[PDB]
From a paper:
HD-PTP drives the degradation of mitogenic receptors by coordinating their sorting into the multivesicular body (MVB) via specific recruitment of different endosomal sorting complexes required for transport (ESCRTs) (Ali et al., 2013, Stefani et al., 2011). The CC domain of HD-PTP is solely responsible for the interaction with UBAP1, and residue F678 in this domain is essential for binding (Stefani et al., 2011).
The crystallographic structure of HD-PTPCC (apo-HD-PTPCC), determined at 2.5 Å resolution, shows an elongated architecture with seven α helices (H1–H7) whose main feature is a central helix of 105 residues (H7) extending the whole length of the molecule. The overall shape resembles that of an ice hockey stick, in which H1, H6, and the N-terminal region of H7 form the blade, and H2–H5 and the rest of H7 form the shaft. Analysis of the structure using SOCKET identified two canonical coiled-coil motifs: one antiparallel two-stranded coil involving helices H6 and H7 in the blade and an extensive antiparallel, tightly packed three-stranded coil involving helices H3, H4, and H7 in the shaft. The topology of HD-PTPCC is such that the polypeptide chain crosses three times over the length of the protein. By contrast, in HD-PTPCC, helix H7 forms a continuous backbone that confers rigidity to the molecule. The DEER analysis is therefore consistent with an overall rigid conformation for HD-PTPCC that can accommodate local flexibility without global rearrangements, ruling out a potential mechanism of regulation by large-scale flexibility of the CC domain. In the apo-HD-PTPCC structure, D667 and K671 form a salt bridge, and the carboxyl group of E514 is about 6.4–7 Å to D667 and K671.
Author numbering: 11 to 117, 128 to 227, 238 to 348
């Protein structure tokens, strides 16, 4: 009979709180602003734990970059050596063709096999070259980062981009977080006063009927506090929207800085995680081209021997 009056008072107050909260949420969500402001600033200067983990892990095996680069050195040397031997085989064969035509104007089997093997190894080198150039491209892609993670930490941190906000921008941000703090305080106060109202309503058990006009007076104070809370919103929203206007540009800046930070970090992680593959593919190249160099050097020997034997067999001229 009297709980219905309290339920009415509570209903009115909850209607007001719900409307105001609704508009507030529309503005706040429309501004992409949250009391957990995405200004970070602190984050930009702190090396990510996972990165420092990777650095410390590289400090236990300091022959990473060294062994990789040296492997690529050997590989390159064998590469150009193979090219040189192939060229020498070609030259010897063309000289033999010349001498054979001269001899034949004024007057085998092994030679054909040699020529075929030469074309064969020329093609093998041709196809492997793509693999090799891909390996060099990966080397360029990752070696610098692998060398950065293997060095001092201050350089790893130096690689990360940092803000350079003018003092004006700093003031703008501080004002924005001040107003956002006021909004948060206002919301916490709103929920707190709500719970105080519910608590006093629930425990208010009473025992002509004008007594209601007297016993409902115990809510007048909480109603004053709540009206003050709800009526202060429009102004703090005006201030917050003005500050946000002054904040759009710094938002742009710090957003681009965020994405650059993340891209840098991701590239460094990618290089660290690619090292192993780099090493195994470099070892594969070294094996492939050590064997190929072996076969091409043997072919060169047999070419010299066969062309010398042909030029010697041209003794009919004696």
């Amino acid at each position: 009979l009297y709980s219905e009056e309290k339920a009415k008072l509570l209903r009115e107050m909850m209607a007001k709180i719900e409307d105001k909260n609704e508009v507030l949420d529309q503005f706040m969500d429309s501004m992409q602003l949250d009391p957990e402001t995405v200004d970070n600033l602190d984050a930009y200067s702190h090396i990510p734990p996972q990165l420092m983990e990777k650095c410390a892990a590289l400090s236990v095996r300091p022959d990473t970059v060294r062994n990789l680069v040296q492997s690529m050195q050997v590989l390159s040397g064998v590469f150009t050596d193979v090219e040189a031997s192939l060229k020498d085989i070609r030259d010897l064969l063309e000289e033999d063709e010349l001498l054979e035509q001269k001899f034949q104007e004024a007057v085998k089997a092994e030679l054909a096999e040699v020529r075929r093997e030469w074309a064969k190894y020329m093609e093998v080198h041709e196809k492997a070259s793509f693999t090799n150039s891909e390996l060099h491209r990966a080397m360029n892609l990752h070696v610098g980062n692998l060398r950065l993670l293997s060095g001092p930490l201050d350089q790893v941190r130096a690689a990360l981009p940092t803000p350079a906000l003018s003092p004006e921008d700093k003031a703008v941000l501080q004002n924005l977080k001040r107003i956002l703090a006021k909004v948060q305080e206002m919301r916490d106060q709103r929920v707190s006063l709500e719970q105080q109202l519910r608590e006093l309503i629930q425990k208010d058990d009473i025992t002509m009927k004008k007594l209601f006009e007297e016993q409902l007076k115990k809510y007048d104070q909480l109603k004053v506090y709540l009206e003050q809370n709800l009526a202060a919103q429009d102004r703090v929203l005006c201030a917050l929207t003005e500050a946000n206007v002054q904040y759009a540009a710094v938002r742009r800046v710090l957003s681009d800085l965020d994405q650059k930070w993340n891209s840098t970090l991701q590239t460094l992680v990618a290089s660290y995680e690619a090292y192993e593959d780099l090493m195994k593919k470099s070892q594969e190249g070294r094996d492939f081209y050590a064997d190929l160099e072996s076969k091409v050097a043997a072919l060169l020997e047999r070419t010299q021997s066969t062309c010398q034997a042909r030029e010697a067999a041209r003794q009919q001229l004696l």
